[PDB]
Amino acid sequence: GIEASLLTDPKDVSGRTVDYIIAGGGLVGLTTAAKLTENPNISVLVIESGSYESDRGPIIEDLNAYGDIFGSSVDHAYETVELATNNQTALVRSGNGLGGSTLINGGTWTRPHKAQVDSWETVFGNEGWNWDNVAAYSLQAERARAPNAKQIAAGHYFNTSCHGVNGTVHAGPRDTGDDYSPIVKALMSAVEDRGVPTKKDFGCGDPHGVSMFPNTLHEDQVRSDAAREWLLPNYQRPNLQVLTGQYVGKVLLSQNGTTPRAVGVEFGTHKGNTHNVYAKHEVLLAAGSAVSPTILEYSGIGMKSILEPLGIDTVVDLPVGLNLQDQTTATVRSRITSAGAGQGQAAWFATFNETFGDYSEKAHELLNTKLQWAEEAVARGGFHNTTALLIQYENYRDWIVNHNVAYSELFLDTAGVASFDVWDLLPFTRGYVHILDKDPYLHHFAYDPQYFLNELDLLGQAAATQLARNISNSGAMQTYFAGETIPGDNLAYDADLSAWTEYIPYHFRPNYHGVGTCSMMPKEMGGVVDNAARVYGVQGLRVIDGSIPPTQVSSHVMTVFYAMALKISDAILEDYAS
Ligand SMILES: Cc1cc2nc3c(=O)[nH]c(=O)nc-3n(C[C@H](O)[C@H](O)[C@H](O)COP(=O)(O)OP(=O)(O)OC[C@H]3O[C@@H](n4cnc5c(N)ncnc54)[C@H](O)[C@@H]3O)c2cc1C
Ligand SMILES: *[C@@H]1O[C@H](CO)[C@@H](O[C@@H]2O[C@H](CO)[C@@H](O[C@@H]3O[C@H](CO)[C@@H](O)[C@H](O)[C@@H]3O)[C@H](O)[C@H]2NC(C)=O)[C@H](O)[C@H]1NC(C)=O
Ligand SMILES: *[C@@H]1O[C@H](CO)[C@@H](O)[C@H](O)[C@H]1NC(C)=O
Ligand SMILES: *[C@@H]1O[C@H](CO)[C@@H](O)[C@H](O)[C@H]1NC(C)=O
Ligand SMILES: *[C@@H]1O[C@H](CO)[C@@H](O)[C@H](O)[C@H]1NC(C)=O
Ligand SMILES: *[C@@H]1O[C@H](CO)[C@@H](O)[C@H](O)[C@H]1NC(C)=O
Numbered sequence: 001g002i003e004a005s006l007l008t009d010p011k012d013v014s015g016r017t018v019d020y021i022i023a024g025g026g027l028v029g030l031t032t033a034a035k036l037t038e039n040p041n042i043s044v045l046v047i048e049s050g051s052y053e054s055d056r057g058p059i060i061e062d063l064n065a066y067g068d069i070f071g072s073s074v075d076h077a078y079e080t081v082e083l084a085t086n087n088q089t090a091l092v093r094s095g096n097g098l099g100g101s102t103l104i105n106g107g108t109w110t111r112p113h114k115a116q117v118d119s120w121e122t123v124f125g126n127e128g129w130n131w132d133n134v135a136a137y138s139l140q141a142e143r144a145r146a147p148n149a150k151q152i153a154a155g156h157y158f159n160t161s162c163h164g165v166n167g168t169v170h171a172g173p174r175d176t177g178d179d180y181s182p183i184v185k186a187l188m189s190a191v192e193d194r195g196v197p198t199k200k201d202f203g204c205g206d207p208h209g210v211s212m213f214p215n216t217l218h219e220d221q222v223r224s225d226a227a228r229e230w231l232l233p234n235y236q237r238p239n240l241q242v243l244t245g246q247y248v249g250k251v252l253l254s255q256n257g258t259t260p261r262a263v264g265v266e267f268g269t270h271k272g273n274t275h276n277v278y279a280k281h282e283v284l285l286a287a288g289s290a291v292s293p294t295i296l297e298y299s300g301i302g303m304k305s306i307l308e309p310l311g312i313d314t315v316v317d318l319p320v321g322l323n324l325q326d327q328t329t330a331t332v333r334s335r336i337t338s339a340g341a342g343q344g345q346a347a348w349f350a351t352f353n354e355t356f357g358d359y360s361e362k363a364h365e366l367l368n369t370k371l372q373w374a375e376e377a378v379a380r381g382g383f384h385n386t387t388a389l390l391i392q393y394e395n396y397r398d399w400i401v402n403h404n405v406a407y408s409e410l411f412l413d414t415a416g417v418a419s420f421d422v423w424d425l426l427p428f429t430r431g432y433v434h435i436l437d438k439d440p441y442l443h444h445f446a447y448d449p450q451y452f453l454n455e456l457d458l459l460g461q462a463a464a465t466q467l468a469r470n471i472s473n474s475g476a477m478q479t480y481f482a483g484e485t486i487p488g489d490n491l492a493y494d495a496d497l498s499a500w501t502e503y504i505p506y507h508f509r510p511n512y513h514g515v516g517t518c519s520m521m522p523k524e525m526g527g528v529v530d531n532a533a534r535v536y537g538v539q540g541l542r543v544i545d546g547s548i549p550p551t552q553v554s555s556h557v558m559t560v561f562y563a564m565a566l567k568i569s570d571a572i573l574e575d576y577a578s
């Protein structure tokens, strides 16, 4: 089986040459490996810190076991710095194994708002990265299944024109075999009373209102992790090699006259037991948004003011690790009556005005006058160029005011409770990730999302979370509401927005959607990679993973990342062919 084909001994690759080295066997990494090795003459080696996990059992394969794997060997559990919002560290869950985070994520399959992806081209000047182009790759990746009658009756709606049916990633309705809970339709009824839409297909380009959605699972409910979808079918390809249990530490650079060229990588598990492997064409970094930037820095690609004091020679000076954008999540949970019994998930993609309610006008005044916020974020080291950050913020203001994009997500789980996980989708805060040591294998790094260090992010989160409590005992939801359990006794039930702002910093987690740490945007705008994911000033080196999106999106990110891996893989093959 696949297990027998996987490499584990570094001596099997040490000193060898392949066409492409892919650092990180995760979502983008394995999608890209699969596409590249469709040409039998192209050799690819994937190097993954973890191993194969796709047949472990329910802890991986059943989406309804979500969270059980946290804290195990399959979770990197990256620790943040001591956060300034609450003086505590946080854990950033991240998958460790073939498939990366797809091994451990919630399986939620949705797309952004059209205007968001269009702005990657029209504001961030990435030629060809508009909604229609990226969406065509997204459709190609997708192998969706329409809902059956019982799934529709629960609240599903599937637009056949918005889903590929002949692709690679199996997606369709989560269906545990229970009857579906009426709470999903009650939430829809409760928001309909407020004028909010329901059942819009979150894959069509306007994610707003309360809808169900597809999940990344096979018809038999087995998790569609990236290794099961893109590696397991293809691992017999002799030109596709996978080494497990080793970390990529740094990219090996040589001089090609005036410009450094990536010629390979060093890998290993501790200082003093490292090895080299070489790439004839390119090194492609796909270790995740917390890690790919650090790999550049360890290699001498990063900010001279960060690298020089650590004792690293800055070969290429770029703002690597800046522009980190993760969301904050909080919970509101209630007990339900026995008539609320059954399975189902749904989500409210809530607009700015839906989020703030009566605070909308004041929130808009801040949005109109404070974009000061850019100066503050820069001063905190989340970004280097105040003008370019302001442009990002004007872009979010355009999204909110001229496109009415969703600004928060209130994610409903049922299956015996009514529980919301709630996050502000569009944080203005900008954080960073930087190495704190020269030795890659020590994994000593500062990951600072700067949660709640922008006032609008704290107000918006507070307002969204308060809204979750509000809707839980509104309209049709009153049918099933059997008293709040979280915050419950920890926060008075009539708490106002001010009280919620005081509560939230002590009751949130990372959302685990960190993007931006090797931003795909022009160099003068603060970018690290061009519109073909190439690191500025280096030949044969790309960063291709969730490091690269320059903005957040009103979406779950898998649909975007599979699409982007396909789009970049074609760019790479175009270059190989020429
Ligand atoms: C808890 C959680 C829940 C989520 N829920 C959802 C959801 O419901 N819907 C959705 O669309 N998305 C969701 N996501 C997001 C999605 O899973 C990630 O954004 C996506 O997998 C990132 O893809 P990537 O290729 O950038 O990185 P990853 O998939 O994280 O892959 C990176 C790979 O690199 C490996 N690695 C790390 N360091 C090294 C090294 N130095 N050298 C070699 N290999 C290395 C890792 O072990 C990993 O396999 C969730 C993520 C998490 C953590
Ligand atoms: C996280 O911990 C730090 C301490 O490491 C807290 O910062 C400190 O907060 C206190 C207030 O609780 C500040 O004290 C104040 O000093 C000013 C003078 O600058 C004085 O005018 C006040 O009357 C008061 O004594 C202190 O300066 C500040 N910084 C440090 C280095 O101690 C921080 O507030 C904690 N954060 C959270 C979210 O709890
Ligand atoms: C279905 O998708 C098509 C093509 O995207 C879209 O134009 C039409 O509005 C959609 N209809 C609904 C009800 O989502
Ligand atoms: C949102 O709220 C403001 C009032 O604060 C109003 O000016 C505006 O038109 C509303 N926007 C939308 C899209 O309804
Ligand atoms: C929800 O919000 C409205 C404001 O229109 C308020 O009147 C109502 O009591 C709130 N309900 C709950 C359960 O908090
Ligand atoms: C800062 O950002 C602006 C806006 O993108 C850009 O015009 C300018 O060149 C940038 N400054 C630097 C030093 O690159």
Ligand SMILES: *[C@H]1O[C@H](CO)[C@@H](O)[C@H](O)[C@H]1NC(C)=O
Pocket (backbone or CB within 6 Å): 256, 257, 258, 259, 261, 539
């Ligand atoms: C330098 O050498 C590379 C070898 O990787 C060659 O293909 C390329 O044309 C050269 N170009 C520059 C700009 O240095």
